[PDB]
Design a protein around this nucleic acid. Structure first.
Ligand SMILES: [K+]
Ligand SMILES: [K+]
Ligand SMILES: [K+]
Ligand SMILES: [K+]
Ligand SMILES: [K+]
Ligand SMILES: [K+]
Ligand SMILES: [K+]
Ligand SMILES: [Mg+2]
Ligand SMILES: [Mg+2]
Ligand SMILES: [Mg+2]
Ligand SMILES: [Mg+2]
Ligand SMILES: [Mg+2]
Ligand SMILES: [Mg+2]
Ligand SMILES: [Mg+2]
Ligand SMILES: [Mg+2]
Ligand SMILES: [Mg+2]
Ligand SMILES: [Mg+2]
Ligand SMILES: [Mg+2]
Ligand SMILES: [Mg+2]
Ligand SMILES: [Mg+2]
Ligand SMILES: [Mg+2]
Ligand SMILES: [Mg+2]
Ligand SMILES: [Mg+2]
Ligand SMILES: [Mg+2]
Ligand SMILES: [Mg+2]
Ligand SMILES: [Mg+2]
Ligand SMILES: [Mg+2]
Ligand SMILES: [Mg+2]
Ligand SMILES: [Mg+2]
Ligand SMILES: [Mg+2]
Ligand SMILES: [Mg+2]
Ligand SMILES: [Mg+2]
Ligand SMILES: [Mg+2]
Ligand SMILES: [Mg+2]
Ligand SMILES: [Mg+2]
Ligand SMILES: [Mg+2]
Ligand SMILES: [Mg+2]
Ligand SMILES: [Mg+2]
Ligand SMILES: [Mg+2]
Ligand SMILES: [Mg+2]
Ligand SMILES: [Mg+2]
Ligand SMILES: [Mg+2]
Ligand SMILES: [Mg+2]
Ligand SMILES: [Mg+2]
Ligand SMILES: [Mg+2]
Ligand SMILES: [Mg+2]
Ligand SMILES: [Mg+2]
Ligand SMILES: [Mg+2]
Ligand SMILES: [Mg+2]
Ligand SMILES: [Mg+2]
Ligand SMILES: [Mg+2]
Ligand SMILES: [Mg+2]
Ligand SMILES: [Mg+2]
Ligand SMILES: [Mg+2]
Ligand SMILES: [Mg+2]
Ligand SMILES: [Mg+2]
Ligand SMILES: [Mg+2]
Ligand SMILES: [Mg+2]
Ligand SMILES: [Mg+2]
Ligand SMILES: [Mg+2]
Ligand SMILES: [Mg+2]
Ligand SMILES: [Mg+2]
Ligand SMILES: [Mg+2]
Lengths: 129, 150, 142
RNA sequence: CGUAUGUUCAA
RNA sequence: GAAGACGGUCGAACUUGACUAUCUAGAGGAAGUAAAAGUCGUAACAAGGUUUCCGUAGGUGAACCUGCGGAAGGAUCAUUA
RNA sequence: GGUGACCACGGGUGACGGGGAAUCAGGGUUCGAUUCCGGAGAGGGAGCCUGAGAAACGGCUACCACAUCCAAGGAAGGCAGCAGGCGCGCAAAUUACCCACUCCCGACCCGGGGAGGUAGUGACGAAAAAUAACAAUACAGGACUCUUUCGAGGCCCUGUAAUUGGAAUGAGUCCACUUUAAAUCCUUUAACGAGGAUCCAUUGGAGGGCAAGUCUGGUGCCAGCAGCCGCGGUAAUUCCAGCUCCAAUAGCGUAUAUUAAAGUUGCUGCAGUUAAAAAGCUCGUAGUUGGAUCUUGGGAGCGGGCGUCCCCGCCUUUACUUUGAAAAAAUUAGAGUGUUCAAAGCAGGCCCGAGCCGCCUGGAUACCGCAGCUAGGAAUAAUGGAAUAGGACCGCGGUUCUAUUUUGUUGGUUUUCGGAACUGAGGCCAUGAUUAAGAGGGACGGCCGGGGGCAUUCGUAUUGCGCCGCUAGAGGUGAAAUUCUUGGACCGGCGCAAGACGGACCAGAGCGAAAGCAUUUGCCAAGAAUGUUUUCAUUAAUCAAGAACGAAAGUCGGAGGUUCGAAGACGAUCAGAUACCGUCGUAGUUCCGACCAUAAACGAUGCCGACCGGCGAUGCGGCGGCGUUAUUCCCAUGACCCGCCGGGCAGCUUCCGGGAAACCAAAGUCUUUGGGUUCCGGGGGGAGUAUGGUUGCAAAGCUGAAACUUAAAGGAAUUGACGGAAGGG
């Protein structure tokens, strides 16, 4: 069955991105999905998206700007300490110049650079570059 | 897909977005809940009760009219079945298959289907025991189950 | 595919433990049969007594008589065939001499065209074969 | 309808 | 207050038996592997001259042969109202 | 009772544990007998005495093994302390000097210490570092400038046991001196000490990998070499040599363990259509994993770094994350410091004038996993609170109990007092149940299917038999013969009996978990898909153990026995023919009941979920729509036509993308590597063999090694050649 809504969403965005589509329908929708999408929006990797209310899990339509190279999930959500964050960056990101690791921390869902600034480790959610 | 079949069917009910009761329904919540009592007392299962209300009385969703699910309404009035209808119908099927096997012991297919049916019964009964719906020691006794159903 | 759940450390550890027996490099050093069966008994070298001089026919596509000796190891009494290197070195060896024997370099496998010989002679009569071959010392003539 | 075989190494 | 003794306790050790581990002898029997130039056939490779192969069973110097069901990794992606 | 698939119990260990060592992208692999800490033992056990402390062994007692002395009555023993011997081995030092150092014991400033220090042996390993340098002549050669281009001059540089020449020095020997407990070595010094500076550098290699000869002689698939590929068969780039050259250098070669290379054990991070691999199929417990949903736009000052952005905030479950405490030293990283440099060491440095009480220092720092403890955070993940309210909250009325107090001449207190239970009537909370998953279960509805079981029916054929007709052949084959036949075979007609089988229709169509499933009709139970504004509400996915089914052959008991047909017999064919061909023919093939559990059980391709191109069909279900046809007209319903949706068997196309390619719309969404989960491969063999266990009536099934051997085995594709393959010449 569907064990991970975030994995389904990020994979669906990744496939439409590679296919040159301008919009992608994401189903079902979760707070973790919306917070993950927001992190990509604040960095410009995706355009506006509209959550659609169906009195159910929800559906989303994301506008794609042709900027994502890959938005991948990490399963399982490993615990990431601040000291081990650098070794995760060297393994998941093409370079330090760009690309982000999305962390769920007690402070909130945030990218790896904001977590380093707020001195909070957390559980890894995914990445994009 | 199905737990005990290779089928991946999607057939189901698509509930409308609007939960509000339509204007053309003159049946009040109490009046609908009293009509439920007659049908359940007549010996109809919650599943069936919903069909008669939906087919001939315009009640699309009893929950929308009354705020309560049919089984939850019957529990309050004390008309609820001793055995949950889904579990009851799986036990009833197992009894019928087992009756067939006694006179058709060459039916290796019926033997295979029975194992599937009893597998669903135990998975269902395990769930009901956890939510404390069935006594903490309810066991399906294939020998004595024929008296419970029909 | 492989399991990835956060609580699968035991399953992953157990599986790698089982699948580690399936490569012969690990099973050779961790079963014990190989060490028990090893004529040297896990030693780099072994001394022995020359039982007889034997000639081994080189494998195709070559043709030659490789000069060897049957040796009985002192430490465990096992009998092995040890190749004698170089041109005229078999003449230095005589019957019932103490010979220091080493491996052929392939860790228990035959080397080159000599079939089934996994050992070579380093010293004879407590004098090196190289020093004999190069004229540094002479077979302990009494 | 109905037959089998071709010593070793070597470009 | 010494020697000494009944009883108790800890108990080495020795004999017997049982269990177990490792090593090892053995008439004979039956395999495997290696080795420049042995004997018999020619089973597999081409439709390999009986298409080959799988399971199972029987048979025959030896490869193998034959029955029954299966596969194509076939020698047919196809055979006409 | 307690412990156990979260691996107990049992066995093994070339297992003392740790600090640590080697290797190093990250992750990690291996080692740790060994100088520091902890433990254990003193030939093997056991029992003890003394003592604060021992189950002590440089204490004792006994037994066991071994061993010494003896006058044969007895007596005595314990190096896994330091040396030393023997034995074992591939494998490891002196029967040296000393309490001076370091420290320990004792009545003790004084004695003792094989603890420890010192030297000896020591290419374990590590650090520094000789084996010449120079100058001129010489000869090539560049070189720098000029000039007939030539050529010339000086100058810089290089090859020559060149021709030399005299300078330098330490290895060496050796006064003293220092060193030191005494010595030694080192450091210094005087003497001496270099030309072939014979004061003489080796070890490996020279086809490739891999740096360096296709030089010369010798041998002639011999001898040998060669880690691998390979060299050698009378002109060897590879053997044996000479010459030369190359690599490292006081060090190199070899063997063996181990690490990287190995993404060839893959958590990061590998494979499983065809190379090795997905269990025959399904159910299923542990295990692992598991939809969505509950306070967010939040005064700034918490600006102008201008904001209707900000780092800043102030509208005690468990995991997790951040913080603080404590975590031996040595080692490792790392700061300082001319051990002369350096590995090292923890020292050293300033100031000479007075050391008048010399001063001036350094002897850092970081990491210490996991667990525990501490204080924050509250996303993510799990879990809980009200449903027969046994509900939250507010006060109210009772039935009780007990300490202090609230009366200081006692005691009785006038007592009150607070808390802790039981209990009644209330009010009040917006009173209290999230949703209804393109998750699942179940209900219902109309269908649908070679799905399964039982019974029944029919069909013609094969075989046999009876009668009849005619007739001499029939059969079989490449040709034959075995064989049947005037006792009438074969053939033709009628009829009967038996048993098997279900043609054509029949499809890249349907159904089933696979195995598999096809004449009619009846009965029995089941099932997918579709339809649904029905119901339940996470009940799910996958699955060690465990369980049901599982072609064919095979086995057991009974019935039957047409046909075919292992075995067998025979006839051919052939060199043989234990075969292919043919004539017979047993088991079997068939039904019933019990076994067996394997197949190229194949899509050689796990399952569940999501996404990713197009097109024509097709089967099932539903919905919509001109028209044709039957249902006589209507009605609906069927047959057809045009579409849509959902589930399925497939097909064509595509530079989706992948792949070693063949190919694959999955075998894609993979170095841009993670949805969940099960099984399983790690060069070819030996070998699915041996052996142990287990199942079976048996055949066998399942589980399943090792020794040893080997440099390929294999996949896909290309070009040729070949073919008792085809097509055209
Ligand atoms: K040869
Ligand atoms: K001292
Ligand atoms: K040479
Ligand atoms: K990597
Ligand atoms: K006839
Ligand atoms: K379709
Ligand atoms: K070819
Ligand atoms: Mg269903
Ligand atoms: Mg399932
Ligand atoms: Mg349905
Ligand atoms: Mg290996
Ligand atoms: Mg040969
Ligand atoms: Mg050769
Ligand atoms: Mg070889
Ligand atoms: Mg022959
Ligand atoms: Mg010949
Ligand atoms: Mg040949
Ligand atoms: Mg040639
Ligand atoms: Mg054949
Ligand atoms: Mg052949
Ligand atoms: Mg053949
Ligand atoms: Mg073939
Ligand atoms: Mg036969
Ligand atoms: Mg045969
Ligand atoms: Mg040990
Ligand atoms: Mg250890
Ligand atoms: Mg240790
Ligand atoms: Mg040891
Ligand atoms: Mg110690
Ligand atoms: Mg002790
Ligand atoms: Mg001893
Ligand atoms: Mg003792
Ligand atoms: Mg001693
Ligand atoms: Mg002692
Ligand atoms: Mg000693
Ligand atoms: Mg003293
Ligand atoms: Mg020298
Ligand atoms: Mg080389
Ligand atoms: Mg080279
Ligand atoms: Mg020659
Ligand atoms: Mg591999
Ligand atoms: Mg394969
Ligand atoms: Mg399969
Ligand atoms: Mg489970
Ligand atoms: Mg969740
Ligand atoms: Mg250091
Ligand atoms: Mg038919
Ligand atoms: Mg199983
Ligand atoms: Mg069965
Ligand atoms: Mg069968
Ligand atoms: Mg049978
Ligand atoms: Mg029978
Ligand atoms: Mg014959
Ligand atoms: Mg026949
Ligand atoms: Mg199998
Ligand atoms: Mg398979
Ligand atoms: Mg399953
Ligand atoms: Mg269908
Ligand atoms: Mg991967
Ligand atoms: Mg293998
Ligand atoms: Mg066995
Ligand atoms: Mg070879
Ligand atoms: Mg193959």
């Amino acid at each position: 069955v569907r064990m991970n809504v975030l994995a389904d969403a990020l994979k669906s965005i990744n496939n439409a991105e590679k296919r040159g589509k301008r919009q992608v329908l994401i189903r079902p929708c979760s707070k973790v999905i919306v917070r993950f999408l927001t992190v990509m929006m604040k960095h410009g990797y995706i355009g506006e998206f509209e959550i659609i209310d169906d009195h159910r899990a929800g559906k989303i339509v994301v506008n794609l700007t042709g900027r994502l190279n890959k938005c991948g999930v990490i399963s399982p959500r490993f615990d990431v300490q601040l000291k081990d964050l650098e070794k995760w960056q060297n393994n998941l990101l093409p370079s330090r110049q760009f690309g982000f690791i999305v962390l769920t921390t007690s402070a909130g869902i945030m990218d790896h650079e904001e977590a380093r600034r707020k001195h909070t480790g957390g559980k890894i959610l995914g990445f994009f570059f | 897909g199905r737990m005990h079949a290779p089928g991946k069917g999607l057939s189901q009910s698509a509930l409308p977005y609007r939960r509000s009761v339509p204007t053309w329904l003159k049946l009040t919540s109490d009046d609908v809940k009293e009509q439920i009592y007659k049908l359940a007392k007549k010996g109809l299962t919650p599943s069936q009760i919903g069909v008669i209300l939906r087919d001939s009385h315009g009640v699309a969703q009893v929950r929308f009219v009354t705020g309560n699910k049919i089984l939850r309404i019957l529990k309050s009035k004390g008309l609820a079945p001793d055995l949950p209808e889904d579990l009851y119908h799986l036990i009833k099927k197992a009894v019928a298959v087992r009756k067939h096997l006694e006179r058709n012991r060459k039916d290796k297919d019926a033997k295979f289907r029975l194992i599937l049916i009893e597998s669903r019964i135990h998975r269902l009964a395990r769930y009901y025991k956890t939510k404390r719906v069935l006594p903490p020691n309810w066991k399906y006794e294939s020998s004595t189950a024929s008296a419970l159903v029909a | 595919g492989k399991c990835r759940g956060l609580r699968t450390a035991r399953k992953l550890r157990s599986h790698r433990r089982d699948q580690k027996w399936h490569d012969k490099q690990y099973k050779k050093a961790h079963l014990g049969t190989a060490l028990k069966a090893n004529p040297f008994g896990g030693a780099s070298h072994a001394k022995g007594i020359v039982l007889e001089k034997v000639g081994v026919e080189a494998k195709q596509p070559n043709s030659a008589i490789r000069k060897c000796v049957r040796v009985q190891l002192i430490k465990n009494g096992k009998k092995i065939t040890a190749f004698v290197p170089n041109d005229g070195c078999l003449n230095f060896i005589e019957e019932n001499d103490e010979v220091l024997v080493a491996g052929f370099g392939r860790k228990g496998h035959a080397v080159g065209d000599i079939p089934g010989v996994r050992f070579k002679v380093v010293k004879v009569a407590n004098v090196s074969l190289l020093a004999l071959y190069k004229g540094k010392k002479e077979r302990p003539r009494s």
